[PDB]
Amino acid sequence: AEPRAYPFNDVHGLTLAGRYGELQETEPVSRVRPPYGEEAWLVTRYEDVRAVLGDGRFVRGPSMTRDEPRTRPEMVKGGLLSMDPPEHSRLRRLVVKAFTARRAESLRPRAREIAHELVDQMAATGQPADLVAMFARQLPVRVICELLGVPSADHDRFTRWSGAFLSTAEVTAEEMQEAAEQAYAYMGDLIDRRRKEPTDDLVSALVQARDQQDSLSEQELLDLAIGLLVAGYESTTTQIADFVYLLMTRPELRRQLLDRPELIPSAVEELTRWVPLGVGTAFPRYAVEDVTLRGVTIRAGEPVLASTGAANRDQAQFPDADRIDVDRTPNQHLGFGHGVHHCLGAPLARVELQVALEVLLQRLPGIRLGIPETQLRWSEGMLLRGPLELPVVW
Ligand SMILES: CC[C@H]1OC(=O)/C=C/[C@H](C)[C@@H](O[C@@H]2O[C@H](C)C[C@H](N(C)C)[C@H]2O)[C@@H](C)C[C@@H](C)C(=O)/C=C/C=C/[C@]1(O)CO[C@@H]1O[C@H](C)[C@@H](O)[C@@H](OC)[C@H]1OC
Ligand code: HEM
Ligand SMILES: [Mg+2]
């Protein structure tokens, strides 16, 4: 009876559903029924979403058993986002000792070179070129190859395997399983090589990482490396396609960044706030005990969807929240999460998104859609929202 069908967002674009603003106003903790899995609470105000994501009483562990609210029939379980302190905390300390802000920044010149190569290839094939296939789907996985220390000769086949892990892939289950097996075997052998002769890449640094006198096991290293790959690939790819879609359809955004390229980092933050990247809200948290939130009792065990897409568009937190203002300040958005699970690749994701906009505007300052905006084909992957193809001219 009472729960609302969720997701509210239409996948065929980046429009924030008007339902979220309505619930922010008058029903900030509400019930939703997803296409698959359990009914759940949905939390939409910036304050409340931040509160749930930062509260020790809201955990992720039950994701390992539960029939989670979701938009696809299958469930992916495990990785860092399935874990709770203290087990989560230990892995996070070790991974961040290796995966530093310094290391992320140090990849900016290689990310620029790879971005320029991808534009070179677009220019070589000629116009219109598909920005999604040729650029957005290529830069983040090649940057992960560079991050981890995959030798250059293996980037193309590593990119091919990794393509099978995207929610937009049309491959068979057996095709995807073969790609997973090859990527895991490849990464294991890469870790064996770096254990034998360390160099200055992330795999070597993960081997060497110590926390107090603790370290990552051989199997933790391999599982965490694969986890970084999936966490850092589809999201960054989709966000690149979405940011350039916005650039190409909003003349003042493009003008402002052509005129003052120094605005690019601020524009990356503002677009990360504005773009409701998720179809709905994934990764439900579970109450460990009864919690009272905005007068509503969330019972021990119940799932709670804390919508960062809605939170980032809350009129109570961001003045004129639906406006894209590249100079917006402050901008304490939740686009890279909040609390203990907050995106650990965020420094790198920011480098990649900044480099993408920098290189495309420098090289292709007239970049624009090659077809009417109403003709764009949107992904029906049901996890993130973005164009399947972006035919561009310049
Ligand atoms: C929307 C992003 C999300 O995408 C996903 O969750 C992607 C899921 C795709 C759609 C899945 O693939 C489908 O599986 C079906 C059973 C068959 C489909 N085909 C073959 C007919 C197939 O397309 C999964 C099962 C693919 C495999 C390789 C996989 O486990 C991928 C995981 C990818 C995870 C993600 O890319 C990243 O999400 C990560 O999920 C982990 C479970 C978390 O721990 C966390 O990682 C650190 C988190 O990142 C922050
Ligand atoms: C634009 C690109 C990206 C976006 C929008 C993004 C967003 C996020 C968000 C919102 C979370 C928290 C999810 C939750 O708590 O429910 C998260 C977690 C994570 N991100 Fe990202 N991310 C991006 C890029 C990357 C990259 C490049 C990497 C790695 C190289 C990465 C690695 C991870 C990992 C490992 C987690 C799980 C952290 C944990 O559970 O402790 N991300 N990301
Ligand atoms: Mg050149």
Side-chain angles (χ1 to χ4, degrees):
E2 170 262 3
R4 289 183 185 77
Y6 186 79
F8 306 142
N9 290 334
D10 189 323
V11 308
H12 312 277
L14 302 181
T15 295
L16 182 69
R19 188 77 62 201
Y20 283 118
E22 297 175 33
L23 305 174
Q24 285 165 336
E25 275 104 78
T26 55
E27 205 185 351
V29 178
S30 69
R31 297 287 296 186
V32 292
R33 175 169 210 187
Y36 298 91
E38 277 183 30
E39 297 177 359
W41 291 104
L42 172 67
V43 171
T44 55
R45 290 184 183 175
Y46 180 87
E47 198 187 325
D48 301 332
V49 164
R50 215 182 33 165
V52 168
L53 287 178
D55 197 302
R57 292 169 300 172
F58 286 106
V59 293
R60 286 281 307 147
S63 63
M64 297 301 302
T65 74
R66 297 294 281 282
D67 182 22
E68 294 199 296
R70 65 193 186 276
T71 49
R72 299 176 63 109
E74 76 278 6
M75 286 183 274
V76 180
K77 294 186 182 296
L80 268 175
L81 193 37
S82 69
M83 300 179 69
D84 303 309
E87 299 83 11
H88 176 259
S89 315
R90 171 188 166 261
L91 291 183
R92 189 82 191 202
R93 282 191 302 272
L94 283 158
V95 175
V96 311
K97 202 83 127 74
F99 194 180
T100 62
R102 183 183 321 275
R103 180 179 297 284
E105 180 59 36
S106 80
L107 285 162
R108 190 184 295 274
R110 277 293 286 145
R112 279 181 180 130
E113 285 179 328
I114 292 172
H116 279 287
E117 289 173 349
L118 297 172
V119 177
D120 289 347
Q121 296 158 22
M122 281 187 295
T125 63
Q127 309 175 215
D130 174 20
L131 195 82
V132 173
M134 302 201 71
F135 192 94
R137 291 230 187 117
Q138 295 281 324
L139 181 65
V141 56
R142 298 175 180 281
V143 168
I144 292 155
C145 286
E146 219 45 56
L147 173 70
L148 290 179
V150 183
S152 291
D154 291 336
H155 287 199
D156 283 353
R157 57 200 185 111
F158 202 90
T159 296
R160 190 169 336 117
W161 296 329
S162 295
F165 311 154
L166 295 177
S167 69
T168 46
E170 294 174 353
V171 303
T172 75
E174 288 79 22
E175 261 177 306
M176 188 179 68
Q177 185 56 41
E178 169 61 20
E181 283 180 357
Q182 296 248 48
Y184 271 90
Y186 187 94
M187 197 57 27
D189 172 70
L190 182 51
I191 296 161
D192 288 331
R193 328 259 241 164
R194 299 303 187 245
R195 183 179 291 120
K196 190 178 182 175
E197 315 191 12
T199 182
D200 52 13
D201 55 31
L202 181 67
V203 167
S204 300
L206 285 168
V207 169
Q208 296 172 329
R210 295 293 182 273
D211 173 51
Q212 311 315 318
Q213 294 71 50
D214 195 9
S215 59
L216 295 171
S217 74
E218 294 185 22
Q219 193 62 47
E220 285 168 337
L221 277 160
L222 173 55
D223 284 333
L224 288 166
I226 294 297
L228 293 178
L229 167 66
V230 295
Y233 184 13
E234 191 163 353
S235 58
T236 309
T237 285
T238 309
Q239 269 297 53
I240 294 165
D242 289 341
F243 285 16
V244 184
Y245 161 75
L246 289 169
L247 243 83
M248 286 185 305
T249 54
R250 297 191 179 215
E252 291 318 305
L253 181 50
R254 175 217 310 276
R255 173 185 91 56
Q256 279 180 262
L257 302 180
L258 284 172
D259 288 353
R260 293 177 55 201
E262 68 273 16
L263 290 178
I264 286 169
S266 184
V268 163
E269 300 303 305
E270 174 68 340
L271 298 167
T272 297
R273 179 195 73 84
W274 188 92
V275 169
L277 179 69
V279 171
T281 298
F283 307 111
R285 270 59 174 172
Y286 296 85
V288 307
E289 57 189 43
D290 296 1
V291 166
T292 292
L293 179 67
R294 230 169 263 288
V296 176
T297 302
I298 297 169
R299 295 285 158 172
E302 298 182 332
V304 175
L305 299 167
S307 171
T308 58
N312 284 341
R313 294 286 284 279
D314 190 343
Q315 300 288 178
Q317 177 60 200
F318 299 101
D320 196 10
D322 301 324
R323 163 174 180 197
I324 300 178
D325 172 13
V326 297
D327 302 307
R328 179 181 294 275
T329 186
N331 190 1
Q332 294 299 120
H333 65 77
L334 304 189
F336 289 113
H338 188 68
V340 300
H341 292 279
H342 74 94
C343 183
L344 61 74
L348 185 57
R350 280 166 169 122
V351 167
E352 295 184 67
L353 293 160
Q354 291 165 10
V355 165
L357 298 183
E358 178 198 289
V359 170
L360 291 170
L361 291 169
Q362 219 162 262
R363 294 287 297 280
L364 314 173
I367 191 171
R368 66 185 170 93
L369 284 177
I371 55 171
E373 183 183 347
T374 49
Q375 276 175 26
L376 290 166
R377 314 182 54 241
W378 287 86
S379 164
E380 288 172 1
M382 306 310 297
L383 297 181
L384 305 186
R385 292 188 303 164
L388 283 170
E389 298 122 4
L390 275 175
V392 299
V393 291
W394 59 88

